[PDB]
Design an enzyme around this catalytic site. Structure first.
Site, PDB file in Angstrom:
ATOM      1  N   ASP A   1       0.501 -14.918 -11.802  1.00  0.00           N
ATOM      2  CA  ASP A   1       0.320 -14.189 -10.342  1.00  0.00           C
ATOM      3  C   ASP A   1       0.186 -12.643 -10.737  1.00  0.00           C
ATOM      4  OD1 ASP A   1      -0.006 -14.559  -7.714  1.00  0.00           O
ATOM      5  OD2 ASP A   1       2.291 -14.222  -7.367  1.00  0.00           O
TER       6      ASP A   1
ATOM      7  N   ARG B   1      -1.033  -6.236  -5.906  1.00  0.00           N
ATOM      8  CA  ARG B   1      -0.043  -6.619  -4.830  1.00  0.00           C
ATOM      9  C   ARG B   1       1.393  -6.985  -5.586  1.00  0.00           C
ATOM     10  NH1 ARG B   1      -2.878 -11.062  -4.961  1.00  0.00           N
ATOM     11  NH2 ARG B   1      -1.710 -13.023  -5.303  1.00  0.00           N
ATOM     12  N   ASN B   2       1.312  -7.198  -6.544  1.00  0.00           N
ATOM     13  CA  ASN B   2       2.587  -7.700  -7.438  1.00  0.00           C
ATOM     14  C   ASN B   2       3.023  -6.656  -8.541  1.00  0.00           C
ATOM     15  OD1 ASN B   2       2.878 -10.053  -5.847  1.00  0.00           O
ATOM     16  ND2 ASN B   2       1.532 -11.000  -7.353  1.00  0.00           N
TER      17      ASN B   2
ATOM     18  N   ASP C   1       7.286  -9.463  -9.205  1.00  0.00           N
ATOM     19  CA  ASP C   1       6.863 -10.737  -8.738  1.00  0.00           C
ATOM     20  C   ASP C   1       7.226 -11.889  -9.765  1.00  0.00           C
ATOM     21  OD1 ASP C   1       5.701 -12.864  -7.074  1.00  0.00           O
ATOM     22  OD2 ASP C   1       3.882 -12.743  -8.300  1.00  0.00           O
TER      23      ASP C   1
HETATM   24  N1  LIG Z   1      11.867  -2.053  -6.102  1.00  0.00           N
HETATM   25  C1  LIG Z   1      11.324  -1.884  -4.922  1.00  0.00           C
HETATM   26  N2  LIG Z   1      11.175  -0.397  -4.421  1.00  0.00           N
HETATM   27  C2  LIG Z   1      10.789  -0.394  -3.201  1.00  0.00           C
HETATM   28  N3  LIG Z   1      10.098  -1.104  -2.547  1.00  0.00           N
HETATM   29  C3  LIG Z   1      10.111  -2.554  -2.932  1.00  0.00           C
HETATM   30  C4  LIG Z   1      10.820  -2.913  -4.246  1.00  0.00           C
HETATM   31  N4  LIG Z   1      10.565  -4.331  -4.154  1.00  0.00           N
HETATM   32  C5  LIG Z   1       9.911  -4.478  -3.118  1.00  0.00           C
HETATM   33  N5  LIG Z   1       9.596  -3.677  -2.112  1.00  0.00           N
HETATM   34  C6  LIG Z   1       8.842  -3.646  -0.716  1.00  0.00           C
HETATM   35  O1  LIG Z   1       9.011  -4.921  -0.290  1.00  0.00           O
HETATM   36  C7  LIG Z   1       7.780  -5.452   0.024  1.00  0.00           C
HETATM   37  C8  LIG Z   1       7.732  -6.654  -0.136  1.00  0.00           C
HETATM   38  O2  LIG Z   1       8.609  -7.292  -1.581  1.00  0.00           O
HETATM   39  P1  LIG Z   1       7.840  -8.227  -2.438  1.00  0.00           P
HETATM   40  O3  LIG Z   1       8.421  -8.037  -3.715  1.00  0.00           O
HETATM   41  O4  LIG Z   1       6.557  -7.928  -2.387  1.00  0.00           O
HETATM   42  O5  LIG Z   1       8.477  -9.496  -1.777  1.00  0.00           O
HETATM   43  P2  LIG Z   1       7.313 -10.723  -1.405  1.00  0.00           P
HETATM   44  O6  LIG Z   1       8.346 -11.867  -1.064  1.00  0.00           O
HETATM   45  O7  LIG Z   1       6.331 -10.972  -2.250  1.00  0.00           O
HETATM   46  N6  LIG Z   1       6.715 -10.118   0.258  1.00  0.00           N
HETATM   47  P3  LIG Z   1       5.030  -9.878   0.537  1.00  0.00           P
HETATM   48  O8  LIG Z   1       4.674  -9.346  -0.816  1.00  0.00           O
HETATM   49  O9  LIG Z   1       5.012  -9.125   1.779  1.00  0.00           O
HETATM   50  O10 LIG Z   1       4.641 -11.126   0.913  1.00  0.00           O
HETATM   51  C9  LIG Z   1       6.792  -4.862  -0.883  1.00  0.00           C
HETATM   52  O11 LIG Z   1       5.516  -4.583  -0.382  1.00  0.00           O
HETATM   53  C10 LIG Z   1       7.344  -3.299  -1.063  1.00  0.00           C
HETATM   54  O12 LIG Z   1       6.892  -2.404  -0.429  1.00  0.00           O
HETATM   55 MG   LIG Z   2       4.627  -9.405  -2.634  1.00  0.00          MG
END
Ligand SMILES: Nc1ncnc2c1ncn2[C@@H]1O[C@H](COP(=O)(O)OP(=O)(O)NP(=O)(O)O)[C@@H](O)[C@H]1O
Ligand SMILES: [Mg+2]
Length: 279
Positions: free
Chosen positions: A145, A149-150, A163
């Site tokens: 993946d 975005r990841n 991710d």
């Molecule tokens: N280590 C980090 N530091 C700062 N912000 C973070 C961090 N991890 C995640 N985020 C924020 O939280 C959001 C969602 O986290 P994510 O790891 O992408 O989880 P997800 O379940 O994939 N949700 P989404 O991507 O929105 O469908 C990200 O787009 C970042 O803006």
């Molecule tokens: Mg995400």
């Protein structure tokens, strides 16, 4: 070597919740909220962290899937892989605590800064990502993946793979018969390369998925981003070779980018749209 989880404490520190403070909500996940905060380490040093919670009334499957991410992440200690600080499981809400990345997800960050970074800055981001992927592949972990975005990006623009839980990012052989290898991650890396140089444009835009699959199979590829150096577009094309055995290894990609960083003048040769190019 990476070891598959189908136990979190094998690769994750159990943190004392007294050492965790929550600042603000920064996102929403599959399993609950994401917030920023602070962690006090055993040495008394205080660092900024991201904190993911497991929603109240979670199912046992949700708990396993949630903590499974920590079990994977905790295996990888590298500057370009998101750092697991630890987990909280002996109290609820259950938590996964990671290093804080101030500029969030790379794709949304770049979209806010269209055309605003130097080519060498962009190459720096891309080299980080490649170095993290080199370590994952060295560990025998296929990410599957890999997408802008990841990837998360910190205050100093350092990019780190995230991710550890998508047709546009997947290699033709992985789409065709689920042949996932580090070479299919290299394909995905090619797409990230395009995403970065396009400042977070969506790969293949909103083309019908069946057309993404058929076009790529026919030898069509994403076109060069505007003002894209020839060296970087060629690297994309190389990552997108139909024959997976002909793609570069991540160590080779890192080496290519290091040369571009060392000889920034190389980047001055520029190539030549929402149209694909044959080849
Ligand atoms: N280590 C980090 N530091 C700062 N912000 C973070 C961090 N991890 C995640 N985020 C924020 O939280 C959001 C969602 O986290 P994510 O790891 O992408 O989880 P997800 O379940 O994939 N949700 P989404 O991507 O929105 O469908 C990200 O787009 C970042 O803006
Ligand atoms: Mg995400």
């Amino acid at each position: 070597t990476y070891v598959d989880p189908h136990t979190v404490h094998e690769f994750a520190k159990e943190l004392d919740a007294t050492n965790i403070s929550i600042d603000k909500v920064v996102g929403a996940g599959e399993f609950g909220e994401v917030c920023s905060g602070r962690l006090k380490l055993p040495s008394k040093k205080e660092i900024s962290v991201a904190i993911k919670t497991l929603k109240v009334g979670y199912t046992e499957k949700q708990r396993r899937d949630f903590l499974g991410e920590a079990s994977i992440m905790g295996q990888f200690d590298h500057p370009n892989i998101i750092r697991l600080e630890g987990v909280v499981t002996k109290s609820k809400p259950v938590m996964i605590v990671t290093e804080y990345m101030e500029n969030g997800s790379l794709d949304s960050f770049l979209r806010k800064h269209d055309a605003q970074f130097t080519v060498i800055q962009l190459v720096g981001m891309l080299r980080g990502i490649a170095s993290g992927m080199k370590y994952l592949s060295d560990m025998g972990y296929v990410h599957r993946d890999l997408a802008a975005r990841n990837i998360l990006i910190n205050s100093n623009l350092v990019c780190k793979v995230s991710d550890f839980g998508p047709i546009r990012w997947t290699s033709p052989e992985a789409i065709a018969y689920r042949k996932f290898t580090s070479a299919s991650d290299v394909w995905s890396y090619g797409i990230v390369l395009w995403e970065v140089m396009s400042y977070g444009e969506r790969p293949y835009w909103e083309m019908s998925n069946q057309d993404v699959i058929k076009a790529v199979d026919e030898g069509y590829r994403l076109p060069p981003p505007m003002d894209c150096p020839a060296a970087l577009y060629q690297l994309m094309l190389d990552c997108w070779q139909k024959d997976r055995n002909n793609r570069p290894k991540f160590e080779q990609i890192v080496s290519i980018l290091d040369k571009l960083i060392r000889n920034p003048g190389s980047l001055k040769i520029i190539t030549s749209p929402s149209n694909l190019l044959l080849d």
